[PDB]
From a paper:
Central to the replication cycle of influenza viruses is the viral RNA-dependent RNA polymerase which transcribes and replicates the viral RNA genome. The influenza virus RNA-dependent RNA polymerase is a heterotrimeric multifunctional machine composed of polymerase basic 1 ([name]), polymerase basic 2 ([name]) and polymerase acidic (PA) subunits, that catalyzes both primer-independent replication (vRNA to complementary RNA (cRNA) and cRNA to vRNA synthesis) and primer-dependent transcription (vRNA to mRNA synthesis) in the nucleus of infected cells. [name] houses the polymerase active site, whereas [name] and PA contain, respectively, cap-binding and endonuclease domains required for transcription initiation by cap-snatching. High-resolution structures of the complete viral polymerase from a number of human, avian and bat [name] viruses, as well as influenza B, C, and D viruses have been determined. These structures have revealed that the polymerase is a highly flexible macromolecule that can assume a variety of distinct conformations, enabling the polymerase to perform both transcription and replication that require different initiation and termination mechanisms.
Using cryo-EM we determined the structure of 17 polymerase-nanobody complexes at resolutions between 4.5 and 6.7 Å; this is sufficient resolution to accurately position each nanobody bound to the polymerase heterotrimer. Three nanobodies ([name], Nb8190, Nb8201) bind at an interface formed by PA residues 615–630 and [name] residues 10–15 (site 4b). Interestingly, we observe different potencies for nanobodies that bind at similar locations, for example [name] and Nb8190 which bind the same site on the C-terminal domain of PA; this is likely due to differences in the affinities of each nanobody for a given site. In addition to the core of the polymerase which was resolved in all structures, the PA endonuclease was resolved in the majority of structures (excluding [name], Nb8190, Nb8192, Nb8196, Nb8202), while the C-terminal domains of [name] remained unresolved in all structures.
Residue numbers in the entry:
A (entry chain A): 201 to 716
B (entry chain B): 1 to 185, 207 to 756
C (entry chain F): 1 to 25, 32 to 51, 57 to 98, 106 to 117
D (entry chain C): 1 to 249
RNA sequence: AGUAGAAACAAGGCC
RNA sequence: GGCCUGCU
């Protein structure tokens, strides 16, 4: 038998219309191809082609790269789902573990530990919402917390009443009703969804200080790691010792506290959204630490009210309202709290040598939102620990490949070697390996917190320029074909995100300090 | 003092700490709404990069098509799709000369495969655009629907069970006056010749999500089922060809890519003497897919298949012939909002041809105005170039031809170049006695690339001295450096099931320790964090804790019931015995000797109602879409336990007019289960033949009853009962 | 890329003084090697080892591209080849002999 | 008896009768994969989202007659509402743990005989002897190596006939294995697994894994042996080497 | 309002 | 008010 695959009919005519411009049939084109032999045709067209088609190499020197321009506009605002630098903790000193316990009872017990409650009043308005709604929501939360305190056994999860206050605060019945085009065509206002470049905003100095204090040590251990199989190999012992060193370095770090806060908050929010889709739910922000003395402790930052969460797509938004205690007066950096409503709820007395301070104690209240993807990715914030400590362990291994011996202990104790991890007005400041660990952990945590497309684009297009600059510093005669194009590609990612703008400022500082 | 991590690069080289520059710990960007805008923008951009071509109107589809081939040579560095037929034919000829026997051999193996390939091979594919319903559906479903429609219309050659016969039927369908399709809202609708042609030549456009590394979103395309067989054969030929080319890196993995990159850099630099300078270009190609004309792929394949049986040439040429006339569906549509009346609306994309432009903004208004002339029956003709890397391997072949065209035998000059090409990305090592020689070599390479419709992205490319470069997120600095930030997203619970997730997590940790140079202490930390997240996700806590969950009661009673609690699986609330030495052992086997026999038997019980196995392909294979790469499959070691359940399905089909698909699913699955019970090898080896179900089932009932009496439980009473029941079903099938 | 040349060594009295200087082509410093031993940390730029603290001062002129080591009240135990470095890059060392 | 009886019951109803009559054997695979269920793009997100629901997993109908509808306190274990496109019913994860504390028990003595590869790995590691860790730069060079340490010198297709004749002796067809190595393998794995009742498909899959040779490209430094490659993560690192000798040697 | 960012969510459909 | 769905 002979296999027959014949092109005929319409499919043949299509073959006659898929040839070069000056061919009439597939038969003729195939005959030409079979009869074709190389006779120096690339050279002829290369000679005839215009010489303006070139890839001239522009030398890259120390004076070539210019600082990246940052956008100008109103200062950048806060985007986090919870307070990071201005958080306050009410504690009970209980022996329970992280997941162990019941949320509502722990929150009520922690809140009863504080005395000095005052009738709440407006301090700094939202500037775009209805602050009285926030005030009434706070008082409602307090009242219903007492209502739970009265009854027999604290419920594991509580549902709140759907008053107009939280109906507005949670954005209920505000989605436009879906209709058919044939019924709405004469409406003049009918147009596309607003699709334009985000608003431009200039960097502010608050994000820098927030990152600075996100890398600082603390008086608690915010990581209680799980169990592993007992180490049997010497390499396993080395790994365990290294891991213990890093845990001692990073556990007492605000980055770990932020990691735990985000993980717990997002886990609770996702579980409540998946379970109580319809009805508004109360969730106290809880985080459990261990003191220097070793006594376990619980901490209550505030409360989250989750709203209707009928989330179908990964981008669908669940709205909630977050309330958090703090002592930082919002009258000093108002531009950082554009979307917050801040009340005055009490006074706190912390033991200090200056008599006793008797500071005010405010409540930051805001309406925020998330999505299934955002919740899932925020509940995997513990991989920031991985990223950071993998980088540090790569450093240690690379250095130990030079000296034939493990170099961890002297790195962590002697602290002789230091890396540039920041710049002071005096100059570049270097810190021990532990400070590098904390700095990288904070960088990863902020990447996970302020994640956005701007961050990805800037990261890629700035890694390109970083590689070029590294090649320059290595004396490898780097060259570029269109550096202005790369600069324009980098500068289009900087729009309004505080984190990416801070990264761009850091990159400019690195260029200024480099190229010398 | 202000902390600044970037300053760390002043002491640690950039590549030794490049992992810090990968923000892969946050949510990747996602698209929210329609992808119609991106589709229209891509169509217009592809058509305007070839504006100087010549216009024609297809006599079959009636759509306007633009042919830029052999068009005017470019006079600027902007992207251009004006590829020259003679130049590319000469490049392929030189490729053949440098590698004699490549095309003939590759065609021989491809001919073998094509003439022995089966239809079922088309089911092994992800979403495909079913034209019977004008929507994306699983490959198997679309194939079944198309086969049903063909059989209803009279095209039954595919009953031979051969993919070549299926393609013969597909082509024969092109010459039919009137086909018939089914729609549910069942209604039988008639499609004329032109409508069916456009439905078979069209592509479905969507928006790509979870794409890290760029601020703007892109659009991707999915073809139909009529054209996927030709694409399969063409890609088989291209893969067989590239496997014989060491300059290609597309048909290999990552480690092979690194090995070939190291080999080529060492070859180029080492052979270079002290007088010759060497430079590496880390090049990316701008608008790679939009500038590759299918007609040029037709030319390349017809040159490859010279002196071959004409049927082979025809079957391999059908694919580019259809791509040259390919159409693209605009997309989902556009959603409008009216705040004055507080409402929203969703207009399908098919109305873009006639809908007024008052609702659209300036950018979208202009895009629609520019794309309207190409709109034919709600879809836009996209002849000039490929949409999204459907011919990856042929593009790699063209790039490898360009790379080989500078072997110093065709350059005819002191300078020369080599390197590695993987579609849309390349590393080019060019050597020349002086900087002028390097400049001339790179200029000529760029010029030759522009003669083949390939453009080099000057903004994303840079040249330095050899020894430092990048290639597909692999940073080479006197040796490849591990990143570990590309695999970070794969350190969580995969989402298959409990046992599968555990095994996949431990295996991923192991692999990233082997390949991506993950440290021991870091690996231990990853194991701890993964175990924590696993327990918190599946509500399976240690059991000795007081963490109240929806599953903490049964777990606690199982804990208190067990005597040797060290053998309990983490899924059942037991301790974790994993460590760096135990990352290559399944959990069940690591705890086998510690389990109590009662719990061991209850766990690994074949009669459990949870374990379900469908086919040999889906036993222990998990499809994990890696970050910054195409979808990939992994073999994970796991023991079939009661924890190997499969999760719930979507269940939203119940509210759609396509609700009868579930009844058909149930009936097909019942019949398949009956056949499997009749033919146990149905899953492991897919049955072949031309008979129908009931014939085989009844006849095997005859024989098995017979022989199982000749020794077994059956009795004469039962054997005769089965024989006459077989006769009963026979007469039932008669009527 | 970085080359380093030390100057200012020689024969000196005990209780004498000596100014080492290292010209370069980054943090800098000074290490020393006695005939019977490997490397000993002296100074880095500031930090000084126990055996030389208060006696010796490290300084640098970034405009001259030079790092200096001002040694005072020298002991016979300071007798070593003093090597300058940059950070991977090491000088050839300058002989200091105290007696 | 039963099998032909549900066959007749299926043929009783017109739609299934038509499906059985017009559908040919070759199309078996197609219709078996015919489904409306799309393959998940983000499995982790939905696994973390579905497990927060009640009745998130699926199980055969038989579960309704082995496990009670509710446990001691009344937490529901299974529901009678079937899945989307199957006769299986959606059930809660507790029904898993319940099955592991009061479900039927069997004799799992033969699982070690089936899952030969994994238990051989465990035995090899249990008797291994570690050594000192030496810190020095390792020149990892990339090489093609065989990962499976129990491959019987057979390819996929070469051992597929052996596997069928071991598990499905009647569907072998024309093939009768010529090589005597295959003869002995068939004899051994036939007499060893003569009454094992795990599943034909899993038995075939594990026999394929054990006998079929598989190869992959990996960065290695030393070793190169099959037994030394499975522990390549534990013996070789970036700057450290851990001497190891599996229990086999 | 809010989330978010080149288009969307701020429940959908069926009676 | 009653009931259905949450990648179709």
């Amino acid at each position: 038998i002979e296999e027959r695959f014949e092109i005929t009919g319409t499919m043949r005519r299509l073959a006659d219309q898929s040839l070069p411009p000056n061919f009439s049939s597939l038969e003729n084109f195939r005959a030409y191809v079979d009869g074709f032999e190389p006779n120096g045709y690339i050279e002829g067209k290369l000679s005839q082609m215009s010489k303006e088609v070139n890839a001239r190499i522009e030398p890259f020197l120390k004076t070539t790269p210019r600082p990246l321009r940052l956008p100008d506009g109103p200062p950048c605002s806060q985007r986090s789902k919870f307070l990071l630098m201005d958080a306050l903790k009410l504690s009970i000193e209980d022996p329970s573990h992280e997941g162990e316990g019941i949320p509502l009872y722990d929150a009520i017990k922690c809140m009863r530990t504080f005395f000095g409650w005052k009738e709440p009043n407006v301090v700094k308005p939202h500037e775009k919402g209805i602050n009285p709604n926030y005030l009434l929501a706070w008082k409602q939360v307090l009242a219903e917390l007492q209502d739970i305190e009265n009854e027999e056994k604290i419920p594991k999860t509580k549902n709140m009443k759907k008053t107009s206050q939280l109906k507005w605060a949670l954005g209920e019945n505000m989605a436009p009703e879906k209709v058919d085009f044939d019924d709405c065509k004469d409406v003049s206002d009918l147009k596309q969804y607003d699709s334009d470049e985000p608003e431009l905003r200039s960097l502010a100095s608050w994000i820098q200080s927030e990152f600075n204090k996100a890398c600082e040590l603390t008086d608690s251990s915010w990581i209680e790691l799980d169990e592993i199989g007992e180490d049997v190999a010497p390499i396993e012992h080395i790994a365990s010792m290294r891991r213990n060193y890093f845990t001692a370095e990073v556990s007492h770090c605000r980055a770990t506290e932020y990691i735990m806060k985000g993980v717990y908050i997002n886990t609770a929010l996702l579980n409540a959204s998946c379970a109580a889709m319809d009805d508004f739910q109360l969730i106290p922000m809880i985080s459990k630490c261990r003191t220097k003395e070793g006594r376990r402790k619980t901490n209550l930052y505030g409360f989250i009210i989750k709203g209707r969460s009928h989330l179908r797509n990964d981008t669908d938004v669940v709205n909630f309202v977050s309330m958090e205690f703090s002592l930082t007066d919002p009258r000093l950096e108002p531009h950082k709290w554009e979307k917050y409503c801040v009340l005055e709820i009490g006074d706190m007395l912390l033991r200090s040598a200056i008599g006793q301070v008797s500071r005010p104690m405010f409540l930051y209240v805001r309406t925020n939102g998330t999505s299934k993807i955002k919740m899932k990715w925020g509940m995997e914030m513990r991989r920031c620990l991985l990223q950071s400590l993998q980088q540090i362990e790569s450093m240690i291994e690379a250095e130990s490949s030079v000296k034939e011996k493990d170099m961890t202990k002297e790195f962590f104790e002697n602290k002789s070697e230091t890396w540039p991890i920041g710049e002071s007005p005096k100059g570049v400041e270097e810190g021990s390996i532990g400070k590098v660990c904390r700095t990288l952990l904070a960088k990863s945590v902020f990447n996970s917190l302020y994640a956005s497309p701007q961050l990805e684009g800037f990261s890629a297009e700035s890694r390109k320029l970083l590689l070029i600059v590294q090649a320059l510093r290595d004396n490898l005669e780097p060259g570029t074909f269109d550096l202005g194009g790369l600069y324009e590609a980098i500068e289009e990612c900087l729009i309004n995100d505080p984190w990416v703008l801070l990264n761009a400022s850091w990159f400019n500082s690195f260029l200024t300090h480099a190229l010398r | 003092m202000d902390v600044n991590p970037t300053l760390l690069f002043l002491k640690v080289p950039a590549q030794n700490a490049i992992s810090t520059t990968f923000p892969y710990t946050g949510d990747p960007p996602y698209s929210h709404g329609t992808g119609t805008g991106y589709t229209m923008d891509t169509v217009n951009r592809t058509h305007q990069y070839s504006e100087k071509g010549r216009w024609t109107t297809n006599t079959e589809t009636g759509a306007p098509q633009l042919n830029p081939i052999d068009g005017p040579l470019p006079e600027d560095n902007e992207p251009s799709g004006y590829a020259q037929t003679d130049c590319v034919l000469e490049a392929m000829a030189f490729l053949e000369e440098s590698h004699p026997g490549i095309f003939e051999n590759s065609c021989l193996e491809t001919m073998e495969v094509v003439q022995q390939t089966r239809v079922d091979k088309l089911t092994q594919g992800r979403q495909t655009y079913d034209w019977t319903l004008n929507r994306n559906q699983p490959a198997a479903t679309a194939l079944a629907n198309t086969i049903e429609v063909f059989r209803s219309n009279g095209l039954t050659a595919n009953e031979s069970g051969r993919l070549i016969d299926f393609l013969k039927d597909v082509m024969e369908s092109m010459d039919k006056e009137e086909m018939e399709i089914t729609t549910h809202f069942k209604k039988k609708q008639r499609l004329n010749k032109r409508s069916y042609l456009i439905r078979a030549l069209t592509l479905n456009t969507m928006t790509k999500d979870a794409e890290r590394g760029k601020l703007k979103r892109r659009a991707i395309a999915t073809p139909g089922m009529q054209i996927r067989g030709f694409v399969y054969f063409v890609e088989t030929l291209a893969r067989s060809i590239c496997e014989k080319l060491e300059q290609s890196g597309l048909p290999v993995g990552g480690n092979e890519k690194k090995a070939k990159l190291a080999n080529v850099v060492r070859k180029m630099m080492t052979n270079s003497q002290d007088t010759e300078l060497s430079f590496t270009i880390t090049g990316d190609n701008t608008k790679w897919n939009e500038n590759q004309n299918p007609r040029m792929f037709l030319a390349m394949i017809t040159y490859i298949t010279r002196n071959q049986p004409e049927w082979f040439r025809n079957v391999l040429s059908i694919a580019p012939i259809m791509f040259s006339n390919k159409m693209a569906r605009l997309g989902k549509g556009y959603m409008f909002e009216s705040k004055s009346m507080k409402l929203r609306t969703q207009i399908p994309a098919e109305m873009l041809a006639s809908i007024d432009l008052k609702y659209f903004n300036d950018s979208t208004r202009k895009k629609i105005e520019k794309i309207r002339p190409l709109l034919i029956d709600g879809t836009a003709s996209l002849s000039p170039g490929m949409m999204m890397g459907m011919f990856n391997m042929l593009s790699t072949v063209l790039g490898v031809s360009i790379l080989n065209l500078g072997q110093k035998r065709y350059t005819k000059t002191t300078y020369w170049w080599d390197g590695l090409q993987s579609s849309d990305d390349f590393a080019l090592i060019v050597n020349a006695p002086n900087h002028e020689g390097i400049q001339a070599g790179v200029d000529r390479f760029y010029r030759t690339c522009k003669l083949l419709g390939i453009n080099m992205s000057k903004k994303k490319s840079y040249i330095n001295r050899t020894g430092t470069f990048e290639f597909t997120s692999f940073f080479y600095r006197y040796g490849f450096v591990a990143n570990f930030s590309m695999e970070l997203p794969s350190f969580g619970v995969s989402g298959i099931n409990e046992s599968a997730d555990m095994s996949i997590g431990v295996t991923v940790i192991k692999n990233n320790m082997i390949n991506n140079d993950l440290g021991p202490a870091t690996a231990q930390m990853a194991l701890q964090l993964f175990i924590k997240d696993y327990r918190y996700t599946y509500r399976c806590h240690r059991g000795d804790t007081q963490i109240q969950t929806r599953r903490s009661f049964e777990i606690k009673k199982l804990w208190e019931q067990t005597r040797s609690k060290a053998g309990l699986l983490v899924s059942d609330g037991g301790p974790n015995l994993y460590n760096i030495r135990n990352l290559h052992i399944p959990e069940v086997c690591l705890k086998w000797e510690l389990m109590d026999e009662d719990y061991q038997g209850r766990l690994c019980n074949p009669l459990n109602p949870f374990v379900s196995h469908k086919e040999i392909e889906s036993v222990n294979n998990a499809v994990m879409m890696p970050a910054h790469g195409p979808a990939k499959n992994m073999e994970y070691d796991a023991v079939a336990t009661t924890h190997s359940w499969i999760p719930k399905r979507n269940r939203s089909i119940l509210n759609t007019s396509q609700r009868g698909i579930l009844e058909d699913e149930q009936m097909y699955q019942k019949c398949c289960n009956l056949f499997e019970k009749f033919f146990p090898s149905s899953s492991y080896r897919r049955p072949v033949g031309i008979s129908s179900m009931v014939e085989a089932m009844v006849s095997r009932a005859r024989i098995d009853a017979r022989i199982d009496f000749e020794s077994g439980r059956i009795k004469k009473e039962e054997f005769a009962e089965i024989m006459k029941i077989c006769s009963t079903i026979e007469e039932l099938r008669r009527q | 890329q970085v080359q380093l040349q030390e100057s200012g060594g020689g024969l000196v009295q005990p209780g004498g003084s000596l100014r080492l200087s290292c010209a370069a082509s980054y943090a800098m410093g000074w290490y020393r090697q006695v005939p019977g031993k490997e490397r000993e940390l002296v100074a880095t730029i500031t930090n000084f080892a126990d055996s030389a603290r208060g006696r010796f001062t490290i300084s640098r002129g970034n405009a001259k591209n030079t790092v200096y080591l001002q040694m005072n009240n020298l002991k016979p135990e300071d007798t070593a080849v003093y090597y300058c470095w940059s950070r991977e890059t090491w000088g050839q060392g300058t002989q200091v002999t105290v007696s | 008896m039963e099998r032909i009886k549900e066959l007749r019951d299926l043929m009783s109803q017109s739609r299934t009768r038509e499906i059985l009559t017009k559908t040919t054997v070759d199309h078996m695979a197609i219709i078996k994969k015919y489904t409306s269920g799309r393959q998940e793009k983000n499995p982790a997100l939905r696994m973390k989202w579905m497990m927060a629901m009640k009745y998130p997993i699926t199980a055969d109908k038989r579960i309704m007659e082995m496990i009670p509808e509710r446990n001691e306190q009344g937490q529901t274990l299974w529901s009678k509402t079937n899945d989307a496109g199957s006769d299986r019913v959606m059930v809660s994860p507790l029904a898993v743990t319940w099955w592991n504390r009061n479900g039927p028990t069997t004799s799992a003595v033969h699982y070690p005989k089936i899952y030969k590869t994994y238990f051989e790995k465990v035995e090899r590691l249990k008797h291994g002897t570690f050594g000192p860790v030496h810190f020095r730069n390792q020149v990892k060079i990339r090489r093609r190596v065989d990962i499976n340490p129990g491959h019987a010198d057979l390819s996929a297709k070469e051992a597929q006939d052996v596997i069928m004749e071991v598990v499905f002796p009647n569907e072998v067809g024309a093939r009768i294995l010529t090589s005597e190595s295959q003869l002995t393998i068939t004899k051994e794995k036939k007499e060893e697994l003569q009454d094992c009742k795990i599943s034909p498909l899993m038995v075939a899959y594990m026999l394929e894994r054990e006998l079929v040779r598989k190869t992959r490209f990996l960065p290695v430094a030393g070793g190169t042996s099959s037994v030394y490659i499975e522990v390549l993560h534990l013996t070789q690192g970036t700057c450290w080497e851990q001497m190891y000798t599996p229990g086999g040697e």
